[PDB]
């Protein structure tokens, strides 16, 4: 169909590879494609080169290498294995005295590998390492909150590499240094560095009053050795001042590159701020036996010059995106690798003393368990390592571009104020000001801008076109925030004739400040409006007509769309829906030109120009992390000629390479009998009829048969006391057959467990005697279907012990996984939403005949209540509906770019073209206007919508151009008394469905210590009656209902047993008893040596334990 | 010290704290019996005091004792009693309860002010014991055990148990609650009307007192059991019996939204 795009802005450059923030980071970290001799000192290479040599025998690092994966990705996901590569390291043990060299390549374990899309596979589960924003290392100067005319100089290294240092001018005049919460005069540390009163008097003497406070006569009297011993006594009291120990401590604190690491970014920032050059990444050096200053004197000089008011010295904005940097997958994984390597080195140094001092190999010296443990920890249990969100392709693509301010080495939730959560002026083009979680995490979790990319130093850069004179070049310069603050940057929509600026006055930014400026003052220009917002925010048409708070929800809810079996791309697109399907690997494309050899449901075979015959296997009905099905459908035909980059198969939630998160439905905006009251939504049963909003969901069930001290658990079809009807769909081995429908209560895997030794109650003795049947040795423990679940069994996997290729965890005989799929139709309680933040639950599904319908008989699909529009201020959906009406009748879709889109007059033109089809067809078919259309036209010209006196057709066109049509009530046939906006809207079925959320419990599992019910739907738990619900009950004055909540309905064992029996017998419920949790409190207070006594009115002890704990 | 599903073991931190105490105490007894010098005995007694402190209130003085290979402080008795997760606030002033459910809420315009729409299966599990008794009174099941075994499988559910459940819930009310419960009207009693589907149906007029809407809210259901609890719910907590706000006195259930627009 025709696709008409709007907008005059030409993007000189396309979007960067959207997953490159993950891909390039990890690639640079591992350097597996670089021959070991040509590796730079970064990443894993830097970690090894930093850890080695291990000096104590001397063990040295030569090189490393990464092997091939022992198993492919699909195998890893199948068998709960980690996708990883073996890491080998060549080390040579040198005896410095003997000269002996014993060289060996030792195996250090496996390192996890990133897949094509930028994710990882940990224990069969897909995970994403989320980038972490933090303060860039360096030297900052911030106003002292106490004294207004004084300042604090902060020296900040990389996380977990060295302490923070605070330089402060005390009120008494002496300059102080604060390290590890201890403070002392900076003069002492200067004296250890070799400074003398002469050098300080000449270097800092330009500022009169401060240097005199710096001077301390007793410090200059003593030589650097005595000052070193004195400083060691000040920093470590109780430790005898051994000079070797003092050198060791001060060196490891300041000058040791192994224990103190400024960033490479931190080094550059210190060099750029202080105007100096660093020989390394430390604050000082140990050279020729003494200490040589690097950083301290320039920072002190800058502090003094800032205090005096010397021009050219500024305080630092610590939320400036030039002072805040991103630590991506590579950096965090490298940190944990470095930790594991340092522990391995401690183990080596410990091994270099014990055993025989002569016969040692690198294989005998190295223990890789610390390194394996550290990497396993980082990938498995970290906060920044998250279970991948792959609901739809956009979910994961956006997940990988997430930026967290939380995690280890970062903020907690209480530590974050307004300054961190704020939108900084430097987020322009780097961090999206819209897309952020709604809740307590607002401003902490954010997302990367579209054209933004993080450079090698960790700062986010945004592109700008160079403007020389009045001519806009096509060359793009990627700037950090600090460099951006230098130029005057015009807006991307400024008028252009050719490459020349066509406006007399242009809108530009100087340090984010908006300003009107002449084209000669224009140094750079925006690339596109797209660069200001995230990827999801760029998928919202007419975004300039939506308030930000609702655009936030539109973005965040596109992440939650469920891939539908008939999903289609919106009628009004933004222009990014194809590239999104491209960069996340949902759809399958052709590598080179060629001709299609074969097309199946399972594979596509292409014969390229090379002559080679390539086969692409298609992923069909695979369960994602969240249960939404991943499956690729072939979009080509046998013998079709394809080019390079042409589509081969559509992925999940895509239509012909366009991102298809929902469906295009015909919507009418009007109240309807209160069924759309307060954001509820009314839908047509025609949606269920043609299988719109029907989605496939697969759930995985699992069961283990293991060895017990009471006998083996066996997976068998033989189950005690079960009818053939109950075992009907089970095969010989006890597992359900593929293709059989399972309902709640049905058996998936039968299993028998040996009963625990129990002396039968005399009742069971007499009962067994009556019926004459012996008690079975085993017990039914079969895996059944949980309440509210079920579907068709599509797969079974059985793994035994002793069969080739498989080994389980100790004690486990066999493991069976059953996969159950279901086709979910739309239903009452399922949540819909559009891209503009309009969301709501389906409250009524009407038969087609009740649905409001156009005069030509066409019923609408969805009825949205207009009351949600004015308060929410998201008009974009209205324009989407207008353009969608036009496109519904013209039979065409559109591309309206963000902030440069289809404007109202063009929409009116398309609406008129549509009205010709809508009405001239009727007039040619031999039909005039309806009486009720005349009544509606009367009431409409009473509203001032149409001009009085024009013909009925002319007035209907005047209404159509406002996007309003005559609408008939299907129940009466009488029209709606006014003209109503009807048009095509893009609506998505969100992941939140009633089938997943409905839950009830009468009685069930109780917790161990408190004996209260469990929580969660999966555990068949109870609802929590919190403090505030108890307040509600008290304020109502309902004492007995409250006592029920406290005793009978939970945590009172005698009470709840008696209550259940009374109810099943028809008797009224008994008086409650003492809550078991109060007994727990009494005993736990006795454990704290506090005597708690429940007394009666005579102050006599009352026993609530009923003599059981009293001797 | 318990065995989990997979045959593994799970234990409380008090066990490791008590083990530390017992070890240091026994070693002190042995060091005293062997007449060790005063430096050694002093160190041992200091470690014993540290262990008693870590048992009673860990982290209170000095570094918190942690399990090997973990930065997580062990959970002492003081940590058990005090805090948002403490015994008082988590298990004493508030409890998880039986005969409760939760589901997504939907607008119920056809309802009367005193009513709410309750899914069938929710009411089947919530009223399960009453339903068993009623299925025993009618001829549907020989006894309670057969009736429960009949409800256990969803395909074994015939159409007489639904009419029996209708007989069961007649006249009784359930509590609807929506978090957060800011004032006493965050919980209200409604006569339930059994509905197909899985959504709770909420009357429009009570949306204001709950601060509820249908952008995806969910509500919890509770069943008052005794005749006393039912009397309290029907007389005091019924939605149609609370029309005015206790804070101001002005009407709380009032025409609003679509209603005001039409009028």
């Amino acid at each position: 169909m025709e696709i008409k795009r709007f907008g005059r802005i030409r993007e000189v450059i396309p979007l960067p590879p959207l997953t490159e923030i993950q891909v390039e980071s990890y690639r640079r970290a591992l350097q597996a494609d670089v021959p070991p001799e040509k590796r730079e000192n970064v990443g894993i290479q830097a970690a090894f080169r930093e850890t080695f040599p291990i000096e104590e025998l001397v063990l040295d690092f030569l090189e490393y290498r990464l092997g091939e994966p022992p198993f492919p990705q699909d195998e890893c996901r199948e068998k709960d294995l980690t996708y990883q590569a073996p890491l080998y390291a060549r080390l040579q043990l040198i005896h410095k005295d003997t000269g002996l060299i014993k060289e060996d390549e030792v195996f250090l374990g496996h390192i996890p590998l990133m897949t094509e899309d930028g994710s990882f596979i940990i224990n069969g589960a897909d995970r994403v390492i989320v980038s972490q924003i933090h303060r860039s290392p360096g030297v900052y100067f911030t106003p002292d909150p106490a004294r207004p005319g004084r300042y604090i100089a902060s020296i900040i290294p990389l996380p977990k590499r060295g302490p923070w240092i605070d330089l402060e001018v005390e009120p008494n005049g002496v300059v102080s240094m604060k390290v590890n919460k201890r403070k002392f005069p900076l003069v002492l540390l200067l004296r250890v560095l070799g400074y003398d009163q002469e050098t300080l008097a000449r270097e800092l003497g330009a500022y009169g009053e401060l240097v005199q406070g710096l001077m301390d006569e007793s410090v200059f009297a003593m030589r650097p050795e005595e000052a070193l011993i004195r400083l060691f006594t000040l920093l470590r009291p109780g430790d005898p001042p051994k000079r070797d120990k003092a050198v060791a401590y001060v060196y490891g604190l300041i000058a040791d590159p192994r224990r103190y690491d400024l960033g490479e970014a931190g080094r550059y920032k210190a060099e750029e701020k202080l105007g100096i050059r660093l020989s390394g990444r430390t604050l000082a050096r140990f050279e020729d036996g003494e200490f040589k200053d690097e950083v301290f004197l320039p920072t002190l000089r800058y502090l003094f010059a800032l205090t005096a008011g010397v021009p050219g010295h500024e305080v630092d904005d610590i939320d400036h995106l030039g002072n805040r940097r991103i630590r991506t997958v590579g950096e965090l994984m490298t940190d944990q690798f470095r930790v594991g390597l340092a522990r391995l080195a401690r183990g080596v140094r410990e091994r270099m003393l014990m055993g025989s001092e002569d016969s040692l190999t690198p294989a005998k010296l190295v223990n890789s368990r610390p390194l394996e443990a550290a990497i396993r920890e980082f990938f498995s249990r970290s906060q920044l390592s998250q279970f991948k969100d792959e609901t739809n392709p956009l979910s994961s693509l956006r997940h990988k571009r997430r930026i967290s301010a939380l995690g280890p080495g970062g903020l907690t939730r209480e530590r974050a104020g307004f300054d961190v959560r704020d939108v900084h002026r430097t987020h322009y083009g780097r961090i999206c000001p819209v897309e952020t979680p709604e809740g307590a995490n607002i401003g902490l979790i954010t997302s990367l801008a579209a054209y933004a990319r993080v450079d090698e130093l960790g700062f986010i850069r945004t592109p700008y076109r160079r403007v020389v004179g009045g001519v806009v070049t096509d060359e793009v310069v990627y700037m950090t925030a600090t460099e951006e603050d230098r130029y005057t940057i015009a807006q991307a929509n400024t008028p252009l004739e050719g490459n020349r600026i066509a406006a007399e006055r242009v809108v530009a930014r100087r340090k984010g400040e908006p300003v009107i400026v002449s084209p000669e003052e224009v140094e750079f220009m925006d690339v596109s409006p797209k660069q200001v917002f995230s990827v999801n925010t760029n998928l919202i048409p007419f975004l300039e007509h939506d308030d930000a708070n609702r655009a936030l929800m539109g973005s965040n809810m596109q992440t939650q769309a469920v891939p539908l079996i008939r999903a289609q791309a919106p009628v009004v697109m933004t222009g990014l829906e194809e590239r999104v399907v491209r960069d996340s690997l949902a759809a399958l494309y052709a590598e080179e030109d060629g001709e299609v050899a074969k097309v199946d449901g399972n594979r596509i075979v292409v014969r390229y120009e090379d002559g080679r015959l390539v086969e692409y296997p298609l992923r069909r009905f695979y369960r994602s992390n969240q249960g939404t099905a991943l499956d690729q459908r072939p979009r080509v035909v046998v013998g079709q000629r394809v080019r390079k980059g042409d589509l081969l198969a559509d992925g999940p939630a895509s239509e012909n390479g366009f991102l298809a998160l929902g469906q295009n439905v015909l919507v009418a905006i009007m109240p309807f009998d209160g069924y759309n009251f307060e954001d509820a939504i009314v839908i047509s049963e025609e949606l269920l009829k043609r299988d719109f909003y029907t989605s496939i969901h697969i759930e995985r069930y699992e069961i283990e048969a293991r060895d017990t001290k009471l006998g083996p658990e066996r997976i068998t079809r033989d189950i005690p006391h079960l009818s053939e009807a109950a075992l009907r769909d089970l095969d010989e081995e006890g597992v359900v057959r593929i293709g059989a429908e399972v309902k709640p209560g049905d058996i998936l895997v039968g299993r028998t467990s040996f009963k625990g030794e129990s002396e039968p109650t005399p009742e069971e003795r007499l009962l067994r005697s009556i019926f004459g049947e012996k008690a079975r040795d085993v017990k039914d423990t079969s895996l059944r279907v949980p309440p509210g679940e079920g579907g068709i069994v599509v797969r079974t996997v059985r793994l035994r012990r002793g069969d080739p290729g498989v080994e389980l965890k100790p004690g486990v005989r066999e493991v069976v996984r059953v996969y159950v799929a279901q086709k979910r139709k739309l239903q009452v309680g399922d949540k819909l939403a559009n891209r503009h933040g309009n969301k709501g639950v389906v409250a009524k599904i009407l038969p087609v005949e009740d649905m409001p319908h156009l005069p030509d008989g066409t019923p609408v699909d969805v009825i949205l209540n207009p009351l949600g529009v004015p308060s929410r201020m998201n008009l974009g959906q209205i324009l989407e509906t207008h353009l969608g009406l036009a496109g519904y009748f013209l039979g065409q879709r559109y591309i309206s770019p963000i902030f440069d889109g289809a404007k109202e007059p063009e929409i009116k033109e398309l609406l008129a073209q549509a009205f010709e089809v809508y009405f001239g067809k009727r007039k040619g078919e031999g039909f005039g206007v309806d009486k009720r259309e005349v009544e509606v036209l009367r009431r409409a010209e009473k509203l001032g919508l149409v001009t009085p006196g024009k013909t009925p057709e002319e007035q209907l066109k005047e209404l159509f151009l406002q996007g309003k049509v005559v609408l008939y009530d299907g129940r009466t046939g009488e029209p709606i008394e006014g003209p109503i906006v009807v048009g095509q809207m893009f609506i998505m079925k969100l992941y939140h469905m009633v089938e997943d959320k409905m839950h009830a419990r009468s009685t069930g599992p109780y917790s161990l210590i408190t004996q209260q019910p469990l929580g969660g739907k999966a555990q068949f738990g109870g609802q929590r009656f919190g403090e505030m619900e108890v307040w509600a009950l008290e304020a109502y004055g309902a004492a007995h209902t409250l006592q029920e909540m406290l005793t009978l309905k939970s945590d009172d064992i005698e009470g709840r047993n008696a209550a259940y029996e009374a109810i099943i017998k028809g008797e009224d419920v008994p008086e409650p008893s003492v809550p078991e949790s109060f007994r727990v409190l009494v005993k736990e207070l006795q454990a704290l040596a506090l005597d708690v006594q429940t007394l009666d009115e005579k102050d006599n002890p009352v026993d609530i334990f009923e003599g059981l704990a009293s001797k | 010290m318990v065995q989990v599903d997979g045959g593994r073991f799970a234990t409380s931190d008090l066990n490791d704290l008590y083990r530390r105490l017992i070890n240091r105490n026994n070693r002190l007894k042995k060091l005293l019996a062997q007449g060790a010098p005063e430096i050694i005995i002093r160190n041992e007694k200091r470690m014993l005091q540290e262990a008693v402190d870590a048992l009673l209130d860990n982290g209170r003085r000095g570094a918190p004792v942690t399990n090997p290979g973990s930065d997580r402080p062990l959970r002492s008795l003081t940590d058990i009693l005090s805090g948002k997760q403490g015994r008082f606030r988590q298990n004493l002033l508030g409890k998880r309860v039986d005969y409760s459910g939760r589901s997504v809420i939907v607008v119920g315009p056809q309802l009367k002010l005193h009513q709410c729409g309750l899914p069938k299966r929710m009411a089947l599990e919530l009223f399960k014991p009453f339903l068993l008794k009623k299925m025993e009174e009618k001829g549907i099941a020989p006894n309670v055990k057969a009736a429960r075994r009949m409800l256990e499988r969803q395909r074994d559910i015939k159409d007489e148990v639904w009419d029996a459940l209708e007989e069961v819930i007649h006249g009784k009310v359930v509590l609807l609650n929506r978090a957060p419960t800011l004032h006493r009207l965050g919980i209200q009693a409604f006569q339930p009307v059994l509905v197909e589907g899985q959504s709770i149906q909420l009357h429009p007029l009570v949306c204001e007192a709950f601060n509820a809407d249908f952008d995806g809210d969910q509500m919890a259901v509770h069943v008052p059991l005794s005749s006393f609890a039912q009397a309290e719910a029907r007389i005091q907590m019924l939605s149609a019996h609370n029309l005015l706000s206790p804070a101001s006195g002005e009407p709380l259930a009032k025409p609003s939204r679509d209603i005001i627009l039409g009028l």
């Binding site: 109780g238 430790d239 | 430096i39 002093r42 160190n43 200091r46 470690m47 540290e50 000095g62």
Partner: peptide
């Protein structure tokens, strides 16, 4: 405040 440091100091007195 630190038991190891205090015990080492007690040790260094003999």
């Amino acid at each position: 405040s630190d038991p190891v440091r205090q015990y080492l100091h007690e040790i260094g007195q003999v």
